[PDB]
RNA sequence: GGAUAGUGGCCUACCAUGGUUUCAACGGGUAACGGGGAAUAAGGGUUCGAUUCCGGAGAGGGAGCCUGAGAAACGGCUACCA
RNA sequence: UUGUAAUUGGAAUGAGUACAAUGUAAAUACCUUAACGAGGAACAAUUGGAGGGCAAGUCUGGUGCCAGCAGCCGCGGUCUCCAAUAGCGUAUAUUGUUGCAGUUAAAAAGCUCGUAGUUGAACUUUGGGCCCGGUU
RNA sequence: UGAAAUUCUUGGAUUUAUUGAAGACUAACUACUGCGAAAGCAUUUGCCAAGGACGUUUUCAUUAAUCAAGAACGAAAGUUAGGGGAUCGAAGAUGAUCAGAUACCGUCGUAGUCUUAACCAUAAACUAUGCCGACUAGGGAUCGGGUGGUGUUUUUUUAAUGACCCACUCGGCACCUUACGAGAAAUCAAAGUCUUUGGGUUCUGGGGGGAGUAUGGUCGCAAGGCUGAAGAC
RNA sequence: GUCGACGUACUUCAUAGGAUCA
């Protein structure tokens, strides 16, 4: 009936700021200036496509 | 001390700290990198065109059952097979194989409904206000 | 010194070895024309601004010119690329 | 004293039609206006949601007569309510300076030194005495 | 061993005693008490340099706190080249494979464990708790220093020292009570600073636990080409 | 190839507690 307390392991999964460098390049560098116009323009073009 | 600089000339450390930490947000990351549309059911579009492959529940005995209103549709954009709802079995008569159907977001697991068939509103056909052009 | 309407490595000849940078230069992305403005928010802030006005650039893409006070003009001309 | 009228009475009016005139470069339209123009005022308002009831009808299951699904199809024969309103529906989209947290459930680096950056003990003409004109 | 069996043994094992050799490790004293930035640190004696705290009516006068870059060290395990090789011992071999509290036991033991010259730089490297500064309760125990007493023992000539008793003061590991505050609670003199928030500064996170599904993405990842069993009458 | 890792996107499991009454 002895239940030891779990040892919450230190994270080995890549942190949110580390995941951005796991791919070939640095994902933060390739970003647009105005994401607001990305979402609006892209959605319209998708329906036109 | 709260673990953050407070000096009157420490504006730069605060800005650079903020810009670095803003990328932690999944919403922020998706917005700037333009990845917010992977999770979208249609891959970013509000509607999807498809080809009616078969009417799965056509042989179900109980009328107007959930199964009777499901159709297996091929998304023309990517060729992935999906399942779509029809408002009622009466509308199912209009839908037959190998016509274009416009799908919109909605038996769990079926997340789409048919809004236009052959370029005509399904509601209009049900209300007897138009004819399906063939 | 040449050229320019004129200042100026703008270019030429001879000279020195300088110029910028962790107070982020240089390089990369930008669905980046800039602003007056627009939306939201209680306030701080966040986003949008091709689009009635101001300013800049272009006339399919580079290159080069006559005329004329004013153009590297394109509803002017010449080549090349398509 | 409540609800319902393909009951019933004569009064009003513009949507529309139209002499004319106004309007306009010329027209159309607006504002005007002779004359027509209303009882299903058929001169026929819409978009969504919710809930019923019916059969010699149909399917499915069972501790009999029942229950679920549902019901434009039966022997012959060729319905009610709710919301908005000249507008209504559907689909996608839509971090803390002020002011976050880090023992026990995100996150304090094994420790120290150390450049940039940020920050950094106290002290130098204080007090007192008069004059003027302003407000409430 | 639960019982056996590999194993040694009439060439004398095991055990007794007198020695000698090799390599590790510093029991009991030993206590979260002490030292060190941490990892760590325990036999005697010598040498080399280093350090906290205490005492100072000594000295310089802001020389300071924190810290991206950069640097020194960093338990155990591990790698390269020598040495050493006692014990223990990953791997490997082998005895037994019967019995569930004794159910993983035994023997041999390579690398390693030790050390020298460099690498590797990871731990529950824990107070699961950054650093500096101030303030906010009582109580007695301890470690180091210092002040004080007409206090005990000792110096067995005195004495002066040493060791004790008491009071206090600095600095430290700490510990009790606490409606002081905080917290949901365990609890905390800090995890407190009168209702919601500013003494200075560095770092980290944008959600946890246990299971899965798919993938227009990124980086990766084999072999095969001459081989053929038949108890009943 | 129903391959491994990672990234991305989703699904899923852990919700009852006190009082009274029969
Ligand atoms: Mg504080
Ligand atoms: Mg552009
Ligand atoms: Mg813009
Ligand atoms: Mg603009
Ligand atoms: Mg031009
Ligand atoms: Mg063109
Ligand atoms: Mg031109
Ligand atoms: Mg022109
Ligand atoms: Mg009109
Ligand atoms: Mg400094
Ligand atoms: Mg000062
Ligand atoms: Mg000791
Ligand atoms: Mg060796
Ligand atoms: Mg090193
Ligand atoms: Mg330790
Ligand atoms: Mg402190």
């Amino acid at each position: 009936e002895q239940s030891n307390k779990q040892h919450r392991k230190a994270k080995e999964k890549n942190t949110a700021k580390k995941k951005l460098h796991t791919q070939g390049h640095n994902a933060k560098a390739f970003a647009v200036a105005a994401p607001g116009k990305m979402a609006r323009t892209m959605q319209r073009s998708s329906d036109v496509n | 001390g709260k673990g953050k600089p407070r000096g009157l000339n420490s504006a730069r450390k605060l800005r650079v700290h903020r810009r670095n930490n803003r990328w932690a947000e999944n919403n922020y990351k998706k917005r700037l990198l333009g990845t917010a549309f992977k999770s979208s059911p249609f891959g970013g579009s509000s509607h999807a065109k498809g080809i009616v492959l078969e009417k799965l529940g056509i042989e179900s005995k109980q009328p107007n059952s959930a199964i009777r209103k499901c159709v297996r549709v091929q998304l023309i954009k990517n060729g992935k097979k999906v399942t779509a709802f029809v408002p009622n079995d009466g509308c199912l008569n209009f839908v037959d194989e190998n016509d274009e159907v416009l799908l919109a977001g909605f038996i769990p697991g079926v997340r789409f409904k048919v809004v236009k068939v052959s370029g005509v509103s399904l509601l209009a056909l049900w209300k007897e206000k138009k004819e399906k052009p063939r």
Side-chain angles (χ1 to χ4, degrees), chain B residues 16-69:
Chain B
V16 175
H17 184 78
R18 181 54 45 222
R19 294 190 321 212
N20 293 322
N21 286 43
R22 287 270 290 296
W23 291 95
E25 282 87 311
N26 290 318
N27 188 358
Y28 193 58
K29 186 212 308 306
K30 287 187 294 183
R31 264 180 30 81
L32 281 173
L33 301 185
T35 306
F37 64 71
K38 299 288 102 175
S39 79
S40 296
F42 304 149
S45 66
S46 53
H47 298 262
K49 302 279 280 293
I51 320 166
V52 172
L53 299 167
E54 62 199 61
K55 289 134 71 172
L56 307 163
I58 189 66
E59 69 275 16
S60 177
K61 284 170 52 64
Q62 285 307 326
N64 195 359
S65 296
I67 296 89
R68 283 194 69 76
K69 296 186 284 191

Side-chain angles (χ1 to χ4, degrees), chain B residues 117-129:
Chain B
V117 61
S118 293
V120 172
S121 167
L122 184 46
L123 261 183
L125 300 199
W126 182 28
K127 291 176 72 68
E128 293 179 353
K129 295 170 73 66

Side-chain angles (χ1 to χ4, degrees), chain A residues 9-43:
Chain A
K9 187 175 318 294
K11 292 188 287 185
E12 70 281 17
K13 299 164 263 201
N14 281 321
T15 51
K17 263 139 73 158
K18 186 73 161 26
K19 288 194 212 164
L20 296 164
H21 300 238
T22 59
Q23 307 299 96
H25 61 86
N26 178 7
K28 298 197 293 185
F30 306 86
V32 299
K37 184 175 76 182
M38 185 64 73
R40 161 161 177 275
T41 301
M42 164 181 310
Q43 212 192 318

Side-chain angles (χ1 to χ4, degrees), chain B residues 81-97:
Chain B
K81 308 327 185 87
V82 294
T83 70
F85 263 50
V86 169
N88 62 70
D89 63 358
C91 295
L92 191 84
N93 296 118
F94 305 123
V95 179
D96 56 19
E97 311 156 20

